[PDB]
Ligand binder design. Structure first.
Ligand code: CL
Length: 272
């Protein structure tokens, strides 16, 4: 995972300038893309503990979805190792990415109500925040344009960041680590009716993010009346879905299931 990545075949757009860094989108268009198209879009956020990682992680998935007619992109965002930020800054960057795609939907050939947020682990957390967590800051961007994604596809996300409703000192410690009140960046704590649809892929033998946290999330989302499809991968570990692991079997399966989810919600045309 090189940073910055090459991302061969990607067009590069700076979606945000902040702390003297240009944050980029690596954009993959379908071969028949034309101006004035209104395609569904997907924005992928890499994983890495909000500390490290690279948009290269989701290059294969971007190529797949561009092949299916989406405008597919991988977003850079600030991380601890490179930028000395905390989780709340990462969340602001992810929201800025969705905002930017919506703002620029016309020139991207994109339907601004068919923008999917996606990511792995910490990036799956970010994608979830774009669907369901209120904005915590108003950066220098179009405030009239919503940051909220229209759907999410999450690969073993972190979804519970506060222990409330499940130690005042631990919540104080988390406040310092996250850059805000832990509940304010905890998707689980913002479960309500009327949220965008999503699909989640999670291994049952995940020792980083316990499967039980995701089962609790999905159960509560379903009780609130939301479409929240949880696909367990029996015995699979954290990062199982990545391109280049386990003969690409879980990679291919998550794409197949994600594709069908996007068909189900009317963001993709059926194959053939
Ligand atoms: Cl694991």
């Amino acid at each position: 995972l090189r940073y910055p990545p090459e991302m061969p075949g990607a067009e590069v757009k700076v979606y945000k300038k902040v702390d003297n860094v240009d944050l980029k989108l690596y954009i993959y268009k379908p071969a028949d893309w034309k101006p004035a198209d209104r395609r569904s879009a997907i924005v992928f956020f890499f994983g890495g503990g909000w500390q490290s990682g690279s948009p290269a992680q989701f290059r294969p998935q971007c190529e797949y979805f561009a092949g299916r007619g989406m405008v597919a992109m991988a977003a850079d965002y600030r991380v601890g190792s490179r930028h000395n930020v905390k989780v709340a800054d990462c969340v602001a960057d992810a929201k800025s990415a969705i905002r930017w795609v919506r703002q620029h939907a016309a020139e991207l050939g994109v339907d601004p109500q068919k923008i999917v947020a996606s990511g792995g682990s910490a990036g799956g957390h970010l994608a979830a925040c774009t669907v369901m967590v209120p904005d915590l800051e108003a950066p220098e961007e179009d405030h009239t344009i919503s940051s909220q994604a229209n759907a999410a596809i999450l690969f073993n996300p972190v979804l519970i960041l506060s222990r409330e409703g499940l130690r005042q000192d631990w919540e104080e410690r988390l406040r310092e680590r996250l850059g805000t009140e832990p509940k304010a960046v905890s998707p689980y704590h913002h479960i309500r009716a009327g949220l965008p649809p999503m699909i989640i892929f999670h291994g049952t033998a995940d020792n980083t993010v316990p499967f039980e946290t995701i089962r609790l999330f999905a159960e509560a989302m379903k009780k609130a009346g939301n479409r929240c499809e949880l696909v367990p991968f029996e015995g699979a570990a954290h990062g199982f879905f990545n391109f280049g692991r386990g003969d690409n079997l879980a990679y291919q399966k998550t794409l197949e299931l994600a594709d069908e989810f996007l068909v189900e919600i009317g963001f993709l045309a059926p194959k053939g």
